[PDB]
Protein backbone atom coordinates (compact mmCIF):
# COMPACT_ATOMS: atom_id res chain seq x y z
CA UNK A 1 0.00 0.00 0.00
CA UNK A 2 2.89 2.41 0.61
CA UNK A 3 3.81 1.82 -3.05
CA UNK A 4 0.56 3.20 -4.45
CA UNK A 5 0.60 5.91 -1.78
CA UNK A 6 3.83 7.50 -3.09
CA UNK A 7 4.91 7.25 -6.73
CA UNK A 8 5.25 10.90 -7.69
CA UNK A 9 8.23 11.76 -5.47
CA UNK A 10 11.96 11.06 -5.12
CA UNK A 11 11.20 8.26 -2.63
CA UNK A 12 9.75 6.17 -5.49
CA UNK A 13 12.97 4.10 -6.17
CA UNK A 14 13.77 3.31 -2.52
CA UNK A 15 10.29 1.90 -1.91
CA UNK A 16 10.35 0.12 -5.28
CA UNK A 17 13.67 -1.59 -4.52
CA UNK A 18 12.42 -2.58 -1.09
CA UNK A 19 9.11 -4.03 -2.29
CA UNK A 20 10.76 -5.80 -5.23
CA UNK A 21 12.98 -7.85 -2.93
CA UNK A 22 10.38 -8.10 -0.17
CA UNK A 23 7.92 -9.79 -2.55
CA UNK A 24 10.36 -12.44 -3.79
CA UNK A 25 9.53 -15.23 -1.25
CA UNK A 26 5.80 -14.94 -1.95
CA UNK A 27 6.43 -15.12 -5.71
CA UNK A 28 8.71 -18.07 -4.99
CA UNK A 29 5.85 -19.75 -3.09
CA UNK A 30 3.31 -19.34 -5.88
CA UNK A 31 5.82 -20.58 -8.49
CA UNK A 32 6.03 -24.04 -6.83
CA UNK A 33 2.52 -25.26 -5.92
CA UNK A 34 1.11 -24.39 -9.37
CA UNK A 35 3.91 -26.03 -11.36
CA UNK A 36 4.97 -28.82 -8.99
CA UNK A 37 2.06 -29.11 -6.55
CA UNK A 38 4.24 -28.66 -3.46
CA UNK A 39 3.58 -25.69 -1.21
CA UNK A 40 6.18 -23.81 0.81
CA UNK A 41 5.88 -21.20 3.56
CA UNK A 42 8.09 -19.74 6.25
CA UNK A 43 6.26 -19.66 9.57
CA UNK A 44 2.63 -20.16 8.58
CA UNK A 45 2.36 -16.37 8.26
CA UNK A 46 0.67 -16.76 4.88
CA UNK A 47 -2.85 -18.03 5.51
CA UNK A 48 -3.24 -20.30 2.46
CA UNK A 49 -2.35 -23.96 3.00
CA UNK A 50 -3.58 -27.45 2.18
CA UNK A 51 -11.34 -40.72 -0.30
CA UNK A 52 -12.85 -37.63 -1.93
CA UNK A 53 -9.67 -35.51 -1.60
CA UNK A 54 -11.40 -32.20 -0.77
CA UNK A 55 -11.18 -32.56 2.99
CA UNK A 56 -8.12 -30.33 3.18
CA UNK A 57 -7.63 -27.20 5.26
CA UNK A 58 -7.05 -23.67 4.04
CA UNK A 59 -5.88 -21.71 7.10
CA UNK A 60 -2.77 -6.13 -0.53
CA UNK A 61 -2.31 -8.94 -2.99
CA UNK A 62 -4.27 -9.59 -6.16
CA UNK A 63 -7.10 -11.56 -4.58
CA UNK A 64 -8.65 -12.23 -8.01
CA UNK A 65 -6.10 -15.05 -8.43
CA UNK A 66 -5.28 -15.99 -4.80
CA UNK A 67 -8.24 -18.32 -4.25
CA UNK A 68 -7.75 -19.68 -7.79
CA UNK A 69 -4.23 -20.81 -6.83
CA UNK A 70 -5.69 -22.72 -3.86
CA UNK A 71 -7.57 -25.11 -6.14
CA UNK A 72 -4.85 -24.96 -8.85
CA UNK A 73 -2.37 -26.58 -6.46
CA UNK A 74 -4.63 -29.31 -5.11
CA UNK A 75 -5.37 -30.56 -8.63
CA UNK A 76 -1.63 -30.89 -9.33
CA UNK A 77 -1.27 -32.79 -6.05
CA UNK A 78 -4.05 -35.07 -7.29
CA UNK A 79 -2.52 -35.59 -10.74
CA UNK A 80 0.83 -36.46 -9.13
CA UNK A 81 -0.85 -39.64 -7.83
Amino acid sequence: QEALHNCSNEHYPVLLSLLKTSCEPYTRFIHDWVYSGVFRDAYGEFMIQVKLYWTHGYVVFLKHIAHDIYVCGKTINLLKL
Binding site: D32, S36, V38
Partner: protein, 150 residues
Amino acid sequence: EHLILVSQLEQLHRQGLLSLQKLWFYIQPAMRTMDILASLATSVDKGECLGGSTLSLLHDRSFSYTGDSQAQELCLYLTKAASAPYFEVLEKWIYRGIIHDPYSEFMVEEHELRKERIQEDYNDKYWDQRYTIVQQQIPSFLQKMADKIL
Protein backbone atom coordinates in the same frame (compact mmCIF):
# COMPACT_ATOMS: atom_id res chain seq x y z
CA GLU B 1 31.12 -37.43 0.89
CA HIS B 2 30.44 -35.17 3.90
CA LEU B 3 34.09 -35.63 4.91
CA ILE B 4 35.03 -34.67 1.33
CA LEU B 5 33.04 -31.42 1.63
CA VAL B 6 34.59 -30.46 4.97
CA SER B 7 38.04 -31.27 3.54
CA GLN B 8 37.32 -28.62 0.92
CA LEU B 9 36.42 -26.18 3.68
CA GLU B 10 39.68 -27.15 5.45
CA GLN B 11 41.59 -25.95 2.38
CA LEU B 12 39.52 -22.81 2.11
CA HIS B 13 40.01 -21.91 5.78
CA ARG B 14 43.74 -22.59 5.41
CA GLN B 15 43.92 -20.06 2.58
CA GLY B 16 42.99 -17.07 4.78
CA LEU B 17 39.68 -16.42 3.04
CA LEU B 18 36.92 -18.25 4.92
CA SER B 19 34.38 -16.27 6.92
CA LEU B 20 31.53 -17.53 9.11
CA GLN B 21 28.86 -16.23 6.71
CA LYS B 22 30.49 -17.98 3.74
CA LEU B 23 30.63 -21.35 5.52
CA TRP B 24 27.07 -20.81 6.77
CA PHE B 25 26.10 -20.44 3.13
CA TYR B 26 28.12 -23.52 2.19
CA ILE B 27 26.77 -26.03 4.72
CA GLN B 28 23.03 -25.67 4.02
CA PRO B 29 22.74 -28.24 1.13
CA ALA B 30 24.46 -30.77 3.37
CA MET B 31 22.24 -29.63 6.26
CA ARG B 32 19.16 -30.70 4.30
CA THR B 33 20.72 -34.12 3.60
CA MET B 34 21.73 -34.78 7.20
CA ASP B 35 18.31 -33.58 8.40
CA ILE B 36 16.55 -36.07 6.08
CA LEU B 37 18.74 -38.95 7.16
CA ALA B 38 18.48 -38.10 10.87
CA SER B 39 14.67 -38.00 10.61
CA LEU B 40 14.63 -41.31 8.70
CA ALA B 41 17.05 -42.88 11.19
CA THR B 42 14.97 -41.74 14.19
CA SER B 43 11.78 -43.10 12.62
CA VAL B 44 13.24 -46.52 11.82
CA ASP B 45 14.97 -46.60 15.20
CA LYS B 46 11.91 -46.05 17.38
CA GLY B 47 9.65 -48.70 15.86
CA GLU B 48 12.28 -51.49 15.67
CA CYS B 49 11.60 -51.65 11.94
CA LEU B 50 13.26 -54.27 9.78
CA GLY B 51 12.34 -56.13 6.63
CA GLY B 52 9.28 -54.93 4.79
CA SER B 53 8.30 -52.64 7.63
CA THR B 54 11.29 -50.43 6.80
CA LEU B 55 10.56 -50.85 3.10
CA SER B 56 7.04 -49.39 3.30
CA LEU B 57 8.51 -46.45 5.21
CA LEU B 58 10.99 -45.65 2.44
CA HIS B 59 8.18 -46.07 -0.11
CA ASP B 60 6.31 -43.31 1.74
CA ARG B 61 9.47 -41.24 2.32
CA SER B 62 10.25 -41.46 -1.40
CA PHE B 63 6.77 -40.07 -2.01
CA SER B 64 6.95 -37.27 0.58
CA TYR B 65 9.74 -34.98 -0.69
CA THR B 66 9.27 -34.03 -4.34
CA GLY B 67 9.33 -30.22 -4.44
CA ASP B 68 13.06 -29.56 -4.80
CA SER B 69 14.29 -33.02 -6.00
CA GLN B 70 17.56 -32.41 -4.13
CA ALA B 71 16.40 -35.17 -1.78
CA GLN B 72 14.30 -37.25 -4.20
CA GLU B 73 17.36 -38.89 -5.82
CA LEU B 74 18.52 -39.77 -2.31
CA CYS B 75 15.41 -41.64 -1.18
CA LEU B 76 14.81 -43.26 -4.58
CA TYR B 77 18.28 -44.80 -4.62
CA LEU B 78 18.00 -45.68 -0.93
CA THR B 79 14.73 -47.43 -1.75
CA LYS B 80 16.44 -49.49 -4.45
CA ALA B 81 19.44 -50.24 -2.21
CA ALA B 82 17.23 -51.48 0.61
CA SER B 83 14.92 -53.37 -1.78
CA ALA B 84 17.78 -55.22 -3.52
CA PRO B 85 17.90 -58.44 -1.37
CA TYR B 86 14.11 -58.48 -1.07
CA PHE B 87 13.68 -58.48 -4.86
CA GLU B 88 16.08 -61.42 -5.09
CA VAL B 89 14.14 -63.42 -2.49
CA LEU B 90 10.90 -62.49 -4.30
CA GLU B 91 12.25 -63.48 -7.73
CA LYS B 92 13.39 -66.73 -6.15
CA TRP B 93 9.84 -67.44 -4.90
CA ILE B 94 8.40 -66.36 -8.27
CA TYR B 95 10.36 -68.52 -10.70
CA ARG B 96 11.04 -71.52 -8.45
CA GLY B 97 9.18 -73.31 -5.60
CA ILE B 98 12.46 -73.30 -3.61
CA ILE B 99 13.24 -70.46 -1.21
CA HIS B 100 16.03 -70.22 1.33
CA ASP B 101 14.75 -67.17 3.34
CA PRO B 102 17.94 -66.37 5.31
CA TYR B 103 16.36 -63.96 7.81
CA SER B 104 12.64 -63.83 8.62
CA GLU B 105 11.60 -60.56 7.08
CA PHE B 106 9.82 -61.81 3.96
CA MET B 107 6.11 -61.69 3.19
CA VAL B 108 5.80 -65.45 2.67
CA GLU B 109 6.57 -67.69 5.62
CA GLU B 110 6.85 -71.46 5.35
CA HIS B 111 5.95 -73.60 8.35
CA GLU B 112 5.38 -77.29 7.71
CA LEU B 113 1.84 -78.65 7.51
CA ARG B 114 3.30 -81.88 6.15
CA LYS B 115 3.86 -83.16 9.70
CA GLU B 116 0.10 -82.99 10.31
CA ARG B 117 -1.20 -84.19 6.93
CA ILE B 118 1.54 -86.62 5.88
CA GLN B 119 1.92 -88.04 2.30
CA GLU B 120 -1.38 -86.49 1.23
CA ASP B 121 -2.69 -83.26 -0.21
CA TYR B 122 -6.14 -84.35 0.99
CA ASN B 123 -6.35 -81.25 3.19
CA ASP B 124 -5.32 -78.74 0.49
CA LYS B 125 -2.62 -77.97 3.04
CA TYR B 126 -0.64 -75.63 0.76
CA TRP B 127 -3.61 -73.25 0.54
CA ASP B 128 -3.89 -73.72 4.32
CA GLN B 129 -1.41 -72.71 7.05
CA ARG B 130 1.68 -74.15 5.34
CA TYR B 131 2.69 -71.29 3.04
CA THR B 132 1.14 -68.28 4.71
CA ILE B 133 1.47 -64.50 4.70
CA VAL B 134 3.00 -62.11 7.18
CA GLN B 135 0.85 -58.95 7.30
CA GLN B 136 3.34 -56.23 8.23
CA GLN B 137 6.29 -57.52 6.18
CA ILE B 138 4.82 -56.48 2.82
CA PRO B 139 6.44 -53.22 1.59
CA SER B 140 2.94 -51.76 0.83
CA PHE B 141 3.29 -51.41 -2.92
CA LEU B 142 3.39 -55.14 -3.70
CA GLN B 143 0.14 -55.34 -1.71
CA LYS B 144 -2.03 -55.18 -4.83
CA MET B 145 -0.28 -58.24 -6.34
CA ALA B 146 -0.14 -60.03 -2.96
CA ASP B 147 -2.35 -63.06 -3.61
CA LYS B 148 -0.87 -63.75 -7.05
CA ILE B 149 2.70 -63.71 -5.67
CA LEU B 150 1.87 -66.39 -3.09
